[PDB]
Assembly symmetry: C3
Homo-oligomer: 114 residues x 3
């Protein structure tokens, strides 16, 4: 899977080891192997949520499967919790878009997963 976090929180407030923690936690939550997990954090962004420039985050999780009603609720609770605890962003200032990818539409290692 691929998880991206865009936030207006400054780079210095992203703690050491945050990307590894995201990798390991997504491994547990999605059940996917850590070797297949890519994570991307983008701090210092020019963003607003509800018109306010208070800390916020816009995120996306793309995955071949393991996307669905109940699963996405669980990811949101896990990921919002991480963003609140580590980046001090309130969960009502976080959007996470979920994408269930067809294997034919994910390229990796000169091929696709299909």
């Amino acid at each position: 899977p691929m998880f991206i976090v865009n936030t207006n929180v400054p780079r210095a407030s992203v703690p050491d080891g945050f990307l590894s923690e995201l990798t390991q936690q997504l491994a547990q939550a999605t059940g996917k192997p850590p070797q297949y997990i890519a994570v991307h954090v983008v701090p210092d962004q020019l963003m607003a949520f509800g018109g306010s420039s208070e800390p916020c985050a816009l995120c996306s999780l793309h995955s071949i499967g393991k996307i669905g009603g109940a699963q996405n609720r669980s990811y949101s609770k896990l990921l919002c919790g991480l963003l609140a605890e580590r980046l001090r962003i309130s969960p009502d200032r976080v959007y996470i878009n979920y994408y269930d990818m067809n294997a034919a539409n994910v390229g990796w290692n000169n091929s696709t997963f299909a």
Copy 2:
């Protein structure tokens, strides 16, 4: 909803109030309450449109509903007009991707909209 603009226009050329203006304009255009509108502007990007690095933008609008042929035409005029007036980006150098998101696939506040 969520609106993101990636542009090679420099940070100093993004006028004060641009995020506030986009928020307010998207609230009226989408009919969604301003509280639900998130905006993200990413200047200073390494980008080309048609092979040239004159001002350009790649944008996305994600919304639970309020996406469709006629509505997206209206958004495109609104958003190209704003990018042209405020960022001096020609409308023929702007791409906007529109995403009609299922409520189950938008996470917010430890849960999803479903």
Copy 3:
């Protein structure tokens, strides 16, 4: 069409002319004129692939049509090859998400493709 690459490779390692090379190669691969190809390269990103911060890339190719199993396999071989030769990124550390966009959901020049 639109091609985006996010990578942890530093700005200085993106060779001069890389955006033009991507423009021309994607024009040939998609069959669309270069005037309609947009490219966005984002270096120096805080990213991990498989828990490792060795060079990697997360990419997306959005196209109105010209997306499918066999085409995406061919795009992946082409794009992994360019990233490996030009950015020295191993193909097993590249993800490319492919998006077949509906004509109604792409805005350009105050209009939509539809």
